[PDB]
Amino acid sequence: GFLKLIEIENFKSYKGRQIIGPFQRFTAIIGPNGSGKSNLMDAISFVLGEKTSNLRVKTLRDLIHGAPVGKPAANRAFVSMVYSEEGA
């Protein structure tokens, strides 16, 4: 089928658990500069798995919320997707 929606925890300006909306056949993510939007794609690649450098980040302990400043949100992060396919 396709990807229904994405769930993030303590990752790239995403405090706590927030349910991102369900994804239709063609949606879009729009916002001004520095709004924290490419990080959604970074999480998509992350749950798919890829080396840290292409996520404009090193050592993979900087990916937690608040880590680039220097004060992490916690030592604990979830990311989770739900794939929706036909046959219910």
Partner DNA sequence: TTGCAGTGCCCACAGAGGCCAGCAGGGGGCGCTAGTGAGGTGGTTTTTATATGTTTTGTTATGTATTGTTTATTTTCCCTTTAATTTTAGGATATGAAAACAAGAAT
Annotated binding site for ATP: 31-38
21 within 8 A of 5, measured Cβ to Cβ: yes
For position 38 contacting ligand ADP by CB under 6 A, the verdict is: yes
Residues near 30 by beta carbon (within 8 Å), at least 6 away in sequence: none
Q: What ranges make up the beta strands (E) of the chain?
A: 2-9, 17-19, 79-84
| Span interacting with DNA, options 5-13, 34-42, 53-61, 77-85, rule CB under 7 A | 53-61
Binding residue for ligand ADP (CB under 6 A) from 20, 44, 47, 67? 67
Total chain residues near ligand ADP (CB under 6 A): 12
Least Å from the CB of residue 8 to ligand ADP: 11
Q: What is the DSSP letter of 64?
A: B
